[PDB]
Amino acid sequence: RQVVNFGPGPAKLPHSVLLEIQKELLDYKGVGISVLEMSHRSSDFAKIINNTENLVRELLAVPDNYKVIFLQGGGCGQFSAVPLNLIGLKAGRCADYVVTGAWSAKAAEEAKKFGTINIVHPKLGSYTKIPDPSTWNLNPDASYVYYCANETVHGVEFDFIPDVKGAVLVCDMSSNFLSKPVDVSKFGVIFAGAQKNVGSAGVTVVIVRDDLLGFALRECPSVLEYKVQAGNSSLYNTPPCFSIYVMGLVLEWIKNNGGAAAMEKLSSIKSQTIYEIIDNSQGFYVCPVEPQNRSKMNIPFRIGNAKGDDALEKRFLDKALELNMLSLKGHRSVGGIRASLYNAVTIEDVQKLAAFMKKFLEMHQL
Amino acid sequence: QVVNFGPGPAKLPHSVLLEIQKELLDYKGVGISVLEMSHRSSDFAKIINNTENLVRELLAVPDNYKVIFLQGGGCGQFSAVPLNLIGLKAGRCADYVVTGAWSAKAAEEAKKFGTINIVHPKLGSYTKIPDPSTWNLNPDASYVYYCANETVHGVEFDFIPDVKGAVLVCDMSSNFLSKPVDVSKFGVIFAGAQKNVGSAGVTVVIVRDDLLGFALRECPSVLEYKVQAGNSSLYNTPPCFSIYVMGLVLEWIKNNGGAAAMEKLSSIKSQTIYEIIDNSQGFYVCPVEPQNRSKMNIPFRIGNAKGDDALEKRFLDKALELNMLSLKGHRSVGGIRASLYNAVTIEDVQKLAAFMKKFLEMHQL
Amino acid sequence: QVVNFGPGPAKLPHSVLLEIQKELLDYKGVGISVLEMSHRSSDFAKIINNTENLVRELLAVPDNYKVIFLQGGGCGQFSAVPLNLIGLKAGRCADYVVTGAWSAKAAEEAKKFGTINIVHPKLGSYTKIPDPSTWNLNPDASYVYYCANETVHGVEFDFIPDVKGAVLVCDMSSNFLSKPVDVSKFGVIFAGAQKNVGSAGVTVVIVRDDLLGFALRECPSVLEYKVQAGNSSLYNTPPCFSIYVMGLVLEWIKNNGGAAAMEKLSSIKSQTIYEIIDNSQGFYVCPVEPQNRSKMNIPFRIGNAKGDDALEKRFLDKALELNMLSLKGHRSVGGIRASLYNAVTIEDVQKLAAFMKKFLEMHQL
Amino acid sequence: QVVNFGPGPAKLPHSVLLEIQKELLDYKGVGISVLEMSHRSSDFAKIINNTENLVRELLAVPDNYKVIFLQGGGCGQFSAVPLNLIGLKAGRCADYVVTGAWSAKAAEEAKKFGTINIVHPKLGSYTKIPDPSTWNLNPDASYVYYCANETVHGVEFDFIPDVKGAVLVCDMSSNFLSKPVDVSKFGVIFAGAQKNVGSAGVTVVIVRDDLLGFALRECPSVLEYKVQAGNSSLYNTPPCFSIYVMGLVLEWIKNNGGAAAMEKLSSIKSQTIYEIIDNSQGFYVCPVEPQNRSKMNIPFRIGNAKGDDALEKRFLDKALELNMLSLKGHRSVGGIRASLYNAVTIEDVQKLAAFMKKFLEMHQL
Amino acid sequence: QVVNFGPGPAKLPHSVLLEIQKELLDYKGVGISVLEMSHRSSDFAKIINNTENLVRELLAVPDNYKVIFLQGGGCGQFSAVPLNLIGLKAGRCADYVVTGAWSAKAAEEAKKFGTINIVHPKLGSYTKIPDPSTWNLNPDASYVYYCANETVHGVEFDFIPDVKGAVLVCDMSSNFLSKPVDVSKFGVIFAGAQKNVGSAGVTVVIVRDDLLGFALRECPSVLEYKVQAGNSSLYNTPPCFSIYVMGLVLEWIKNNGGAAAMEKLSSIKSQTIYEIIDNSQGFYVCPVEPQNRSKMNIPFRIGNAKGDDALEKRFLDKALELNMLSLKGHRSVGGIRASLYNAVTIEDVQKLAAFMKKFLEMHQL
Ligand SMILES: Cc1ncc(COP(=O)(O)O)c(/C=N/[C@@H](COP(=O)(O)O)C(=O)O)c1O
Ligand SMILES: Cc1ncc(COP(=O)(O)O)c(/C=N/[C@@H](COP(=O)(O)O)C(=O)O)c1O
Structure with missing residues (x-):
């Protein structure tokens, strides 16, 4: 019984992917060592993390004015990183949030540690629908607008890109990343924990428009600051080497499928x-x-x-x-x-x- | 060869890599991979609890010390230890001993969260440990930070310094479990797993259970010691495979x-x-x-x-x-x-x- | 690779080729090969009945329809359809729709058994389906024949044509079980297994039970629907192995x-x-x-x-x-x-x- | 056991089943199953040619005879033999030698295409071959048919009968290649391959090349000796796997x-x-x-x-x-x-x- | 494996055996084997002097001690030690500490050359070391003998026993150069090389220079400490190859x-x-x-x-x-x-x- x-x-990984990881787990492509032993500053891993970024850009049609970085901390880490990097974009330190489920609510609550958070829609009696965007109360002075594309616990998913009247759009796509094409130009920041749809736990992919760097707060950890990491090509410190290698194998699998x-x-x-x-x-x-x-x-x-x-x-x-x-x-x-x-x-x-x-x-x- | x-x-024990390979598709018969395993399963509960008990046994960790597994690596704790501890005393002051590049980097990172004083006179070359007596300690400093082993310059403490009763925070990334350590004399110990105990992705933190709650407001929840300790390092999805890898390396350390x-x-x-x-x-x-x-x-x-x-x-x-x-x-x-x-x-x-x-x-x- | x-x-699922290989010498432990199995044994009875059950299930074939397995391939039915049905009405007429090479071959073969009227003018190029509303149908024709999917020219029906109550026959050889079909609207469906649902050697035919007993005297017994439906495809030795292979492919389609x-x-x-x-x-x-x-x-x-x-x-x-x-x-x-x-x-x-x-x-x- | x-x-040689098993996924390195192999490919031409040569070699078939492989089994030939040959003389009559169950079945089936005359008195029991001297032969008959071996009653010809120079059609299904045969004495020999030369699905038919071109108008093109001989049994998709199996059994007979x-x-x-x-x-x-x-x-x-x-x-x-x-x-x-x-x-x-x-x-x- | x-x-280091093999026929270009080397050659003098220097360096042998290589194994010193030292006092008495089968065998052999007294009561089992304060020492005994590591019973000394000033002879064949040794507190240290420092054939003896010349008349010249130390272990033909082999093991212990x-x-x-x-x-x-x-x-x-x-x-x-x-x-x-x-x-x-x-x-x- 399988x-x-x-x-x-x-979640589940492709069987052929798990076969390749098992095959080269002690001698990755003749290098003589494992990915678990590989130095993040070697040429061998340089190809792995570059090929992974190239796959993210190709599969999502990421424009050239977007930075693609791989951070630690999971999705809940980005719940802090997004306000840390972006809530200071406008002086009011205000941020608009669209709460459609448990994970968008958990993110709106975490953002209150860094600024004044406002839920743009009247509260939902039950997470069973997306409040009509025509009923949203958007702050024109908000630094950004946050929403969760797919709610893992409640099964509520956006099948559209909301019109935030031109605001900086932030989206949490951890539970539907690369399950559908996305027009990345409409967004300011896209992030997704890899453990759900594009690999194994440990690494978080983040797509940032290159003009949104440099608004980070003084209290933002260097390892979560987008400007610092995008400057070091995700190599400010030792990245989750094996989880970036596993992610590339799952991405290569999506491309071949x-x-x-x-x-x-x-x-x-x-x-x-x-x-x-x-x-x-x-x-x-x-x-x-x-x-x-x-x-x-x-x-x-x-x-x-x-x-x-x-x-x-x-x-x-x-x-x-x-x-x-x-x-x-x-x-x-x-x-x-x-x-x-x-x-x-x-x-x-x-x-x-x-x-x-x-x-x-x-x-x-x- | x-x-x-x-x-x-760094290098992993060849015995460990062999077992990781043998059970990569069917971990101990459960039917799935550790890469596929849910952190909220009873199977991963055995994995993360076995890794914790090995950290406690091999280092003789007292029962009043929390052992949590975080993400962010070593440089994550360069920001995590001030966010969690720099507010222990109202001054938001910290004493930092700079014996090499990694203690200097942590000293620079801590400047983002309070008043950071370097304890000794600045060295011309990281070739020696400034004698603990010539240390300009602040009595109201929230904590004192030093690095047990400077990986770039080769300067290692073969002793636990005296800080006049201050809470001691040490960076043992490049010597973790390379020697017995008196955990009782420390307040916070952290070490990135990739050097001497695991693979890149996870960081061990040993914190005395009476230093939680001094976290600043801007401390990210995944890095707040109080939050993660109260969730057994499961406040969010932890680096499962990295924790499973470390559990096997700790097992190898014990058997040797x-x-x-x-x-x-x-x-x-x-x-x-x-x-x-x-x-x-x-x-x-x-x-x-x-x-x-x-x-x-x-x-x-x-x-x-x-x-x-x-x-x-x-x-x-x-x-x-x-x-x-x-x-x-x-x-x-x-x-x-x-x-x-x-x-x-x-x-x-x-x-x-x-x-x-x-x-x-x-x-x- | x-x-x-x-x-x-055509290609067969790797899963199917594997189980055929494992069981080639000892099918399910009965001691012999499917190639050595007698069509009268209780073992082959389970095989052909399961293959019949899957066809009825995967297509929702009603109870008033017979499902039989003949030999002679698709071209065999180019002669077996007229021999069995051209005598529904005394005129020995049949309306054919020629959308490509395979409907053209069937129309020419049917001329051996009666007068065949092609319902639309010559197309000049097999690049479209003539509009069913412009179809010149004979109200005294015995049946209307058309090929659902033309394997040579890539012209497929995405609808069931209205033939104004005429008995409808369809050559679904190259798209059989590639989509649901409203079997109630057809009189005879047939498909060579070697294109979509198994390997060459067997042809599945779905006939309404009131269309039996209209076969001409010149029809071979092994190709007469009435004879083969009365004996449950066992009037003589059937392609035992080719029916067994089809059952595994159908079981594969059901599982997917x-x-x-x-x-x-x-x-x-x-x-x-x-x-x-x-x-x-x-x-x-x-x-x-x-x-x-x-x-x-x-x-x-x-x-x-x-x-x-x-x-x-x-x-x-x-x-x-x-x-x-x-x-x-x-x-x-x-x-x-x-x-x-x-x-x-x-x-x-x-x-x-x-x-x-x-x-x-x-x-x- | x-x-x-x-x-x-019937049973197949254990060495044949062992070879079919190992080549089932990758036939002689080409990368596909024979069940997937196209009947128009270079690989299958080599298969069907080798099967025909072995038939000509082991039976010493003269060059003026066609060796074609058909579907429908032996009972299919019970209709293909009349359809192809009963029009040889204008009377459309055929003489049949009933020695058991399969001769009577074939004689009765032939009555659907012309007037059939049993040459000997009705035997009270299928226990002896009526002496060829007792045969009442029609000098105007189109052919003379007899079954070499009656599989149900165990009555076998150990001679080629004298039919007064008429065209001789023989049903050797259950004794094909169990002994040498003077093929030059026959007009048509056929045999289902599932009894002594292979698996079910294909029938071997040996026809003298001047008897082509006497088929009736109602003969299905897949069963017409002239059509199939002109297409090397490839008028439509032939039972490819059955012919591959039949070739291997022929090779086993040759090696023995x-x-x-x-x-x-x-x-x-x-x-x-x-x-x-x-x-x-x-x-x-x-x-x-x-x-x-x-x-x-x-x-x-x-x-x-x-x-x-x-x-x-x-x-x-x-x-x-x-x-x-x-x-x-x-x-x-x-x-x-x-x-x-x-x-x-x-x-x-x-x-x-x-x-x-x-x-x-x-x-x- | x-x-x-x-x-x-016992086992020799794999690296040592490799060098012995590589230069077995042509020892460092000389053109001959060590097995062919004359002990009186300039080449072999370099080898035995090298081995002596390594023993002095590794054990920190003071200058007032002679290092000699003799034949006879460990049991050869069971006789050589009494013959050379039991005459140190006119009583011809010696004290022997029996903790296992090798000190027991050494005590029996010592009776051939004087009156031997075992210092403690016989144990029911060789499972412990008798308490040194419970030792009945003869103040007029020539020496006091004991075995540091009993190979058969696994009883080992982790100390140097106080013999109240008597000259101390120790049998260290089972742990020679497994730990630093205070050579000054002994009179004679001996160890067969075939256990922890080389191959069988040669035995090392470390003698204090003031203990030479007390050998009895019946002592063989090849086993007399004064004779061999007087010829730098070259009184006769010494085991040249066993000394060369031992020198490599010593070189291996030094590099580790x-x-x-x-x-x-x-x-x-x-x-x-x-x-x-x-x-x-x-x-x-x-x-x-x-x-x-x-x-x-x-x-x-x-x-x-x-x-x-x-x-x-x-x-x-x-x-x-x-x-x-x-x-x-x-x-x-x-x-x-x-x-x-x-x-x-x-x-x-x-x-x-x-x-x-x-x-x-x-x-x-
Ligand atoms: C003492 C100490 N503290 C922190 C780190 C970094 O941990 P990370 O923050 O997880 O990368 C390290 C990692 N040392 C590595 C860092 O190399 P890098 O400069 O990152 O390529 C080394 O010495 O080469 C460390 O040794
Ligand atoms: C729609 C449709 N109907 C009938 C047939 C005939 O199958 P058979 O009579 O079993 O060969 C076929 C077989 N088509 C194959 C025939 O190849 P062929 O021309 O026989 O080499 C093809 O399209 O290449 C078919 O596609």
Whole structure:
């Protein structure tokens, strides 16, 4: 029985990628050492981190006026780095935030340590929709505007780029990075933790417009300052060498599988398969997210009713584990069930979940 | 062949790399990779808790000391230790002992968060440790910071300095677990894993549990000691594979005799090279005073104290021809540098010893 | 490393070729090969019944439809369809729609068994589908025949044509189970397995149960639907191994999302190649109208519409160096033809996409 | 341990299955399966040519005969033989020699294309070949048909009959290449390959090259001898894998001594069983007159001429317990039947003979 | 791959054996082997003088001591020590400390040359060192003898016992040059080279120069200290090759850090094994008391203190299967004995440590 890994982050990696890492784990391409032993200042690793940046630029069509850097600290680290580097862009130290789920809320709260944060929309009773941009109250003197493209815990995803009336746009794409093409010119800063969609945990990719450097605060750590790191080509200090090497192998895998354009159509096929089972389930599976904001990456749902049948949800997760389908348990803050369908999750995998969901419904529906 | 004298990231034990390779696709039968593993799983809980217990056992860490695993490397703590501690006393003052390039870098970084005073008079050359008595200590300084092993200049403390009861913060990146350490006398110990205990990506921090909460407002949450300690280093996704790698290297250190056996091997390896430099009749020149000579990093010059560039080039070329990697000195000092961390075996240093002996035998006048 | 763009026989899933190899000497532990298995044994009964069940499941074939497995390939049904159905009405007439080479061959073969009226005027170039509303249908015709996907000219139906209540017959040889089909609207569907759902030697035929018993006297017993449906495809020895191979391919299609997912995967594959042609600025020429372009077979020319023989040879030569087999166009059209059947993965097509993009960038004037 | 006495499909040489298994993913280094191989490729031309040459070599087929490989099995030829040859003379009549189940099936099928006349009186039991002197031959008949070996009743011709110079069509399916054959005496020879030369899916048809061009109008083009001979059996996609398998079995026959050695081996094998029957003192009864006994299929009963069902079941149940498969007689006859085709080794017949001897020793009253 | 745990002769450094091999036919260009070198040549004089200088340098032998190389092994000094020194006092009495089989064998041999008195009561088992204050010393005895490291029983002295001024003779064959030695406090130190400093054939004796000339009349000239020291160990033909071999081992010990490094390596190696024995839950049983445990020879039992014969046999069988040689204990004690001399590297000990850990995990209940 082969394992089906629906991991939410860290998540599943392509099997062929794990085969290459295992192959050259003790003698990387004849150099004689491992990537785990490789000096970050050698020519050998210089090609690895340069090829990784070249892949990020190619796959996302990143314009030449954007800097691509690899930092540590994960996504939650960028929750501090974005205000540290950008909240001083305008004297008021004001920043606008769009809270559509748990991770955009966690980021807005963290930004209050560095400036006056304002949520541009009236609070949502439940993270089940994106507030209409026509209802946003945007500060014209705000340094930037922040929003989260894909909410991992709640399954709410933007399928558009919001109009911030010309403001500096900041976006958190950790749970949908390189699942679809992006017009990078519309953004000021894009960041994404690699552990979810483009590699393994340890490294965070950040795409910064080159004219936004140099507004960092005095309290910004040098290792998180965009100007410092973009000047040293992500090599101000020792970067997560192995995680940048793993990321390049996952990026090379996306390119060989059709790039961002193909990942979007595949993400449609996978998410549709599950969403159709839910909508036709006659209430047996309950996804409260509204259809136009449903995420193609994370599909959280309940069983039985809108509040969730705990016994039925316990049998579901237990029968799914004996079938070697891991990490289907929803986030501990919402409970229920969460199916994550990142790039590495194959169509045959979603089919296994889809068949199990149809067989489980035929067996417990009333 | 291949003998890796890397400064950091450095060589890993060949036994460790073999196990990482064996279970990269199916970690101990669970069915997934550690690269694929979730930090909120019970499987990674065993990994990160086993790594913590090894840090506590091998270093004899008291139970009133938190052990957290952060990101950002060494230079991350250059910003993390002031953000977490410079506000311990209202002055926002800190005493810094600059014995080399890494203590100077941390001293410069701390200037972003308060008043930073360098304790001694500025040295002309990082070749000696300013005697602890000539230290201009501030009684109201929030903490005193020094670097146990200066990787670029080869100046290592073989003692714990006296700071008149101040909380002591030490940077042991390039000598972590190379010798037993009295953790009780320290307030905060940090070390980047890539030099002597793991691979690049994760940093060990040992903090006395009564120094949390003095964090400035601008301290990022992933680097705030109080936050990460209260979440067992799981406030956000930690460098899972790096923590798993370190757990195996710590396991290797334990099986070979712990911190007690590492120190004895550190002396054998370091003295083997130092005997060659001292008996070299001026062919090899190491400027460090013998009492402060590092046992991990040995920088020296060839030909003269200023360095014979043409001679040092044939050295590094012939050394590369013999598959001895990363012997080139740091770019700010030049010359040669031999890094003899835990994974570097006695067999390795003997190869470097026989090579330096013959090279001197063929180029000295 | 080989990328198989074969047009029929075509590529099989690597998963399927592996299980066929493992079980070649001892199928499921019964002691013998499938090649040695008797068509009367209880073991082959499970094989052919499962292969019948999968066809009914993956296409949603209603209960009033028979599913049989014949020999003779697709061209066998060019004679078996008239022999079985041209006598539905006493006139011995049949309406045929000639959109390419394979419907043209079927129309000429049917003239041996009756009077055949082609429903539309000659096209001059197989580049479009004549409008079904302009179709000259005979209300006394026994059936209406049409080829859903023309493997040589790349002309595919993206709809079911209205034949005004006439018994409808379709040649789905080259797009069988590449998309869902409303079987209720058809009278007879047939498809050679060697193009999309297995290996050569067997032909699947789907017949409405009231269309049996209209076969002419001259129809062979092994090709009479009524005879073969009455014996469950076992009137004589069936292609046992070829039916077994089909069952594994169908089981592979079911495990990958059924026909619904094949249609969307075929959209990704064909859109990737067709866009390279449209943006080629005349370097790649596909004369088929976009509304009728095939998602399975993409024939095109290089250089200009009539074809540059020099560029088309280097394309096929460099494609052969890269192990991209069977990309040469059919003998009657020449040029290039890429076949993107079910087993052809997205990763395969990307190798073709990168090669066509690089060839254009290197020879475009 | 399994001993396969299958009637058809039958056992294949273990060395053939071993080679098919190892080349199944990468046939002779070309990079693809034969199941994926195009029938128009250089590789398959070499396969189908080698299969034809071995047929011509082992049977010594004269140059004025076409060797074509068809689909539809032997029952397919039951229609292809009349469709191609019943119009040879204007009367459209054919004379048929019914010696068992497969002659009667073929004679009845032929009645769908012309007037068929059995040349001999209806035999009360298929136990003897009517003396060729008794044959009532029509001098205006288009051909004379007879079955060489009746697989169900065990009646075999050990001579080429005299048909007064008429064109002779023979159904050698169950004794093809079990002995040399004077091909020059025949007009059409056909044989399903699943009994003694390969796997199910392909039929070998040897036609004298002047009998081409007499096919009826209703003959399917895939079954027309003239069409297929002009296309080297490549008018449409042929059963590629079956022909590849058939070639390997032909190579195995050639390496084991050709048709001459098969006749010597088939004599030793059938004698081993008949000797048990002839000396069984009525315990085993074989109704066929010994001068017409088949050397390939040995049907018999246990107990008495009509057969004791209680004893025959215990025989088959114990035989199945010993892993001896397909010993049950045909459904229309019941009882026991042993098929001893070329792949059935001498040790296989030795296991059966030792079992029959012990079974006779345990139940003979 | 072979790991040599021999008790004596033991393993030699792989580098030393390589040099012996390379220059076996042409010792440093001279044109002859060492095996052919005349002991009276200028070439061999350089060799034996080199070996003597290395012994003085590594052990810090004061100038008032003679260093001589003799034949006869260690047992040769069991006779040579009484013959040379028992006449130092007219009583012909000598004190012998019996801690194991080698001091016991040395005490018996000493009775041939005088009245020998064992200083303590016979132990029930050679598991500890009798307390030095419990020693019954003869003030009129010529000398006091003891064995520093008992190879058979694993009892080792970690001190220089106070003999109240008497001249002290010590048997250091099992730990010679495994640690710094205060040579001044002894009268005669001897050690067979075949255990920790070379190959069999030669024995080193360190004699204080004021103790020469007390040899009895029956002392052979080749074994008299005054004779050999008077001819620089060249009274007769000395074991030329065994001295040359020994000189390379000494050169190897010097390049690896002298005796101070051999002391640290012995601590790491012995403790790695002892930690497994103390934590074995009685699975491994070392009978020696912790304060007298040898660091060169570790004897233990498996299963219980008396030893499970079947369990220890499967231990030695899998040890041989893993190419770990000479682990079987001495015949008088049985069980397992692991020898950890200077040439036995840490990797060798780690190999054994992992094997002992896995042998326990698969046999312990
Ligand atoms: C003592 C000490 N402190 C901090 C660091 C850096 O850790 P990082 O901040 O994780 O890179 C290091 C790493 N030493 C390395 C740094 O080299 P680099 O200049 O970064 O290429 C070396 O000596 O070559 C260190 O030795
Ligand atoms: C749509 C459609 N219908 C019928 C056939 C005939 O298959 P067969 O009769 O089994 O060969 C085919 C076979 N097509 C193949 C035929 O190749 P061929 O021209 O036979 O070498 C092709 O397109 O190249 C088909 O594509």
